[PDB]
Design a binder for this molecule. Structure first.
Ligand SMILES: O=P(O)(O)O[C@H]1[C@H](OP(=O)(O)O)[C@@H](OP(=O)(O)O)[C@H](OP(=O)(O)O)[C@@H](OP(=O)(O)O)[C@H]1OP(=O)(O)O
Length: 159
């Protein structure tokens, strides 16, 4: 639908999600991408026109995509999907040609309180806890460095 919300400045799609950590902070909850079933990402989704804040979207998507309930304990701020829709060298560095972001992500750290077996997307995805090291590799394999930046801002133990 066109319940979707876009940055009035950049036209980027506004998305909220959760870095869901175990109480002991050693593991993060990851879900499989719907499109590519072997990519592990974190729960996230489009803000809808009715939603009063990013926390509402984040907790709605964490339940819908991962069957996860918990408490928001930190605002992890924003990251951008800077994937292009070719290059510009500058003497001692190279860059992709200027473009607006595809997506602006608002991420929150959640402490997991419960995982349920039945949730709206429970037949369309897997959901599993990973150590920092495994999660980092997962998000590089998924080609989602912005999701890794959000994970790095979380209190997850990096030992
Ligand atoms: O609503 P759409 O425009 O189709 O957005 C999709 C959708 O993102 P949302 O969950 O934010 O709606 C996919 O996510 P899921 O199907 O996994 O829930 C996501 O795929 P990822 O799983 O890899 O995030 C994909 O992004 P991609 O470009 O990687 O296909 C992204 O499309 P956009 O490129 O338009 O954001």
């Amino acid at each position: 639908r066109e319940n979707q919300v876009y940055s009035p400045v950049t036209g980027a799609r506004l998305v909220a999600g959760c870095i869901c950590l175990t109480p002991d902070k050693k593991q993060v909850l990851m879900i499989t991408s719907s499109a590519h079933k072997k990519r592990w990402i974190v729960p996230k989704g489009g803000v809808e026109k009715d939603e009063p804040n990013y926390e509402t979207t984040a907790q709605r998507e964490t339940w819908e995509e991962a069957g996860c309930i918990g408490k928001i304990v930190a605002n992890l701020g924003t990251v951008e999907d800077m994937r292009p829709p070719q290059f510009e060298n500058s003497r001692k560095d190279s860059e992709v040609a200027k473009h607006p972001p595809r997506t602006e992500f608002h991420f929150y750290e959640l402490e997991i309180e419960n995982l349920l077996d039945k949730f709206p997307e429970c037949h369309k995805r897997h959901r599993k806890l990973y150590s920092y090291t495994e999660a980092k590799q997962n998000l590089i394999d998924a080609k989602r460095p912005e999701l890794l930046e959000a994970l790095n801002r979380s209190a997850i133990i990096k030992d």
